[PDB]
Amino acid sequence: STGSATTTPIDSLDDAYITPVQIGTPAQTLNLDFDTGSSDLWVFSSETTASEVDGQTIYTPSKSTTAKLLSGATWSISYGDGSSSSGDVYTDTVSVGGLTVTGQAVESAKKVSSSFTEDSTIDGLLGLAFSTLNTVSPTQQKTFFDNAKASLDSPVFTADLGYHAPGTYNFGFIDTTAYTGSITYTAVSTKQGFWEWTSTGYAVGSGTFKSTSIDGIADTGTTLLYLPATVVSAYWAQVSGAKSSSSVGGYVFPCSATLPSFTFGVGSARIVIPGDYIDFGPISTGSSSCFGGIQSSAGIGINIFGDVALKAAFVVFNGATTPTLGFASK
Ligand SMILES: Cc1ccccc1CC(N)=O
Ligand code: NA
């Protein structure tokens, strides 16, 4: 089997991407944030505290003939940005892009933090990291990918995110029309439950490539590129008037600037992030200070190849017995 779904920016900055997901019978379509940095499929629901819902579409398990309470199971998650949700668990039929899983754990939110409530465009998350991170207790549950894997034509999914445009998530096949050149595969460590890999180095603009190992995660649910402070300083040093602002919470630059590209290594291959991808616009409405898309990881504990980086590539998440990542230009 295979599946193929379009993923769409939630706003003009590509702050996140939503993908329609069918849950239940008859189908209830919710727009979920596909997140390769977490492992819970959770949704706004008929159980979510009413004051914490503001425009989301909700899953109502009582309207699904295939929903079953997973008796005694609870979940609770906290994300890198300080956001959180928790609740109880149903099993139900879940379909993405024509690929169906029966008996998928659907984590129904009873509580969500303010950041979720304030985003009407995101009805929940679909985690695509390793199932060892799933938070369901007392019986840990599998991701949609892990449940689909044995049925897929190939045990893979691919992320092809757009710059200010829709893109695609495919399951079970590699669309050879979706990228240019060849795919370079690189080793993955699953020790922390992430798609963790080692970049071979970087370049700023037309500058020389610096060969250096940068260990980080491929995380579709993180907007920006978070790298070591040395790398980030070297990038922003090439932008007149850029500075790190403690008041704003990262590097800002004059909105009059033209940003250089950023290149990262994948083995002997190179992925180029155009400068425009690194512009996240005014820090507040009407400001002439703009927020940068490359930020320091120093206060995180891990480097994160988030959407800024991933949207510059066709990315293969190879879930074979020994997982690997693949990157191609596009
Ligand atoms: C949308 C999302 C994804 C991962 C973590 C947290 C969020 C909420 C946010 N807007 O900061
Ligand atoms: Na921000």
CB 148 within 8 A of CB 76: no
CB-ligand 1 contact for 16 (6 Å cutoff): yes
CB-ligand 1 contact for 33 (6 Å cutoff): yes
The method recorded for this entry reads X-ray
* Closest among 233, 228, 236 to 291, alpha carbons compared: 236
Cα separation, 95 vs 104, whole angstroms? 10
**Taking every pair of C-alpha atoms in the chain, what is the biggest distance, in angstroms?**
60
Structural domains of the chain in order of their starting residue, each with its CATH number = 5-174 (2.40.70.10), 175-330 (2.40.70.10)
How far, in Å, are 6, 125, 129, 206, 229 from residue 38 at the CA level? 20, 9, 5, 35, 25
Residue 10, number of CB atoms within 10 A of its CB: 16
CB-ligand 1 contact for 14 (6 Å cutoff): no
Q: Which two tokens stand for residue 3?
A: 């599946």
Radius of gyration in angstroms for the set of CA atoms belonging to the chain, rounded to a whole number: 20
Cα separation, 24 vs 132, whole angstroms? 25
CA of 308 to the centre of ligand 2 (A): 13
Q: Among 81, 119, 125, which residue has the most ligand 1 atoms within 8 Å of its CB, making it the best to mutate? A: 81
Cα-based torsion angle of the residue sequence 306, 248, 117, 15 in order, rounded to the nearest 10 degrees: -30
Dihedral angle sign, alpha carbons of residues 42, 47, 53, 57:
positive
Give the catalytic positions in this structure: 35, 199
Residue 139, number of CB atoms within 10 A of its CB: 11
Q: Which helix (H) or strand (E) holds 114?
A: helix 114-117
Q: Are strands 28-35 and 124-127 parallel, antiparallel or unpaired?
A: parallel
**Angle at CA 323, nearest 5°, toward 15 and 151?**
90
The alpha carbon of 89 is separated from its chain's Cα centroid by a whole number of angstroms, namely 22
Cα separation, 158 vs 164, whole angstroms? 19
DSSP letter, residue 49: -
CA of 250 to the centre of ligand 2 (A): 9
Q: Among 83, 128, 135, which residue has the most ligand 1 atoms within 8 Å of its CB, making it the best to mutate? A: 83
CB-ligand 1 contact for 113 (6 Å cutoff): no
**Ligand lying nearest the CA atom of residue 224:** 2
**Ligand lying nearest the CA atom of residue 113:** 1
